[PDB]
Amino acid sequence: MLYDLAKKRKTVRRFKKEKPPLEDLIYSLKVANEAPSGMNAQPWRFLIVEDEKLKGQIRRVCERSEKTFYENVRGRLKEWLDEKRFTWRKPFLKEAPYLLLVFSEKSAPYSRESVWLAVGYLLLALEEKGLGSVPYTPPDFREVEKLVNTPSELRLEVILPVGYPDDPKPKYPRNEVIVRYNTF
Amino acid sequence: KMLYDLAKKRKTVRRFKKEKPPLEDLIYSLKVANEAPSGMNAQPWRFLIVEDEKLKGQIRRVCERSEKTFYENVRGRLKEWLDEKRFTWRKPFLKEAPYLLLVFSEKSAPYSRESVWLAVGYLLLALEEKGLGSVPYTPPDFREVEKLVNTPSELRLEVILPVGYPDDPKPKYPRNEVIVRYNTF
Ligand SMILES: Cc1cc2nc3c(=O)[nH]c(=O)nc-3n(C[C@H](O)[C@H](O)[C@H](O)COP(=O)(O)O)c2cc1C
Ligand SMILES: Cc1cc2nc3c(=O)[nH]c(=O)nc-3n(C[C@H](O)[C@H](O)[C@H](O)COP(=O)(O)O)c2cc1C
Ligand SMILES: N[C@@H](Cc1ccc(O)c(F)c1)C(=O)O
Ligand SMILES: N[C@@H](Cc1ccc(O)c(F)c1)C(=O)O
Ligand SMILES: [Cl-]
Ligand SMILES: [Cl-]
Ligand SMILES: [Cl-]
Ligand SMILES: [Cl-]
Ligand SMILES: [Cl-]
């Protein structure tokens, strides 16, 4: 059941050393590709990073940026990150077998909405395929974009480290949906 | 059998039956969506289920007005696409759908819009599982629609998802092959 897939899917920030077959990622992208999009532009573009040096570069730029983020973060954000024991360290950027970088075509109508919708599909597909991921959002997208020679027409949306999950931490809670009717 | 089949089958539904699906069907989709990840697990989505005919009509007309102006002004690829598909500013599905599921994002949440749109992906697949149809309807201006439903300032209307039973919807548009590159561009 889809609900079961969605319910079971949780963040995975720790991956097995073994690299999943590319076919599983490609499957998930093919699923994502079936998603709707503004003017059916299919404004998602995928970059699968496997190169260890490059992952290392991405890891390092992201961590350097996160370091600053963590130095300064405060309030509610800080409290949540602290309670969940996040730090600037993002080893999964190096250690995940794949970094799936998801880009949006800037010029496409509702490109961002569409890509993120498709990421929803993507994540469910990864779960279906028994892969883990985390939508990792670097503090500074541009540095990562440059690392991979992102064309100006594309916008990096998210870095999805993908791999076999490795003793992932538990899914965080979900509050029940509380619907409203007609108006607030 | 596979999620791909579900995703592949799912397509826009702009033609709805009047017949009201059980609320539980729609709530199921929200429950699925709600299992989605989100920035700081904020679960920044909020759902407003519009069923009231008068309000649907108000929403419809506000959107249509906005669309009408937009159709007068749209240019480039979107205009070309809309024209070739014979889209117009009229949005009858906003009246015909038994539900308008208004999906809001909690503005203050980190990556709130990204997260909500991600969850909408879930949501659409769930609707498909339940045999419901929808369309992520995005009028040019949400502000008037937000006001119609007394949207709190903290929330951003992201999308109007008319939801109902499909009434012989038009076929799915094609999909280009997914575009996958390795390591760098
Ligand atoms: C972010 C987003 C916004 C959309 N906005 C509209 C809209 O305003 N009006 C509409 O008729 N369809 C809208 N759509 C539906 C798209 O036109 C549709 O997903 C695309 O044509 C592909 O349809 P298909 O899956 O049936 O091939 C939107 C879709 C997305 C993802
Ligand atoms: C838009 C978005 C951005 C995210 N950014 C990050 C991130 O930068 N770092 C991270 O560790 N997790 C990130 N996540 C993962 C969230 O922390 C995670 O989805 C949330 O904690 C719920 O996890 P759960 O599904 O395992 O309960 C992001 C999730 C989304 C949807
Ligand atoms: N929102 C306008 C234009 C439009 C239509 C379809 C779309 O996919 C889209 F992005 C935009 C409409 O519904 O006609
Ligand atoms: N990007 C930062 C902060 C962060 C972490 C988790 C999140 O869900 C999020 F939105 C933001 C990190 O990975 O530590
Ligand atoms: Cl996650
Ligand atoms: Cl659609
Ligand atoms: Cl939490
Ligand atoms: Cl916002
Ligand atoms: Cl239709």
Q: What is the DSSP string of chain A?
A: -HHHHHHH------B-SSPPPHHHHHHHHHHHHTS--GGG---EEEEEE--HHHHHHHHHHHHHHHHHHHHH--HHHHHHHHHTT--S--THHHHSSEEEEEEEETTSTTHHHHHHHHHHHHHHHHHHTT-EE--B--S-HHHHHHHTT--TTEEEEEEEEEE-B-SPPPPPP-PPP--EES--
Nearest CA in chain B to A33: B178
Experimental method: X-ray
Please indicate, yes or no, if residue B51 is contained in any of the structural domains: yes
Q: Which CATH number goes with the domain that contains A96?
A: 3.40.109.10
Is B171 a domain residue?
no
The answer as to whether A177 is a domain residue is: no
Neighbours of ion ligand 5 (CB under 5 A): A 11, 134; B 37
Is residue A92 assigned to a domain? yes
On whether residue A135 sits in a domain, the answer given is yes
Resolution in A: 1.6
Domain limits at B24? 3-164
User: What is the number of domains present in chain A?
Assistant: 1
Q: What are phi and psi of A129, to 5 degrees?
A: -85, 0
B176/B155 Cα distance (integer angstroms) = 34
Residue B176 inside a domain? The answer is: no
CB contact A74 to B (< 8 Å): no
Asked if residues B145 and B23 have their Cβ atoms less than 8 Å apart, the reply is no
What CA–CA distance (Å, rounded) separates A60 from A58? Answer: 5
Q: How far apart are CA B175 and CA A149, in angstroms?
A: 26
Residue B51 to residue B95: CA distance in whole angstroms: 9
Among residues B140, B81, B6, the alpha carbon closest in space to that of A31 is found at B6
C-alpha B95 to ligand 9 mean position (Å)? 14
Residue A182 lies in a domain: no
Note whether residue A78 is domain-resident: yes
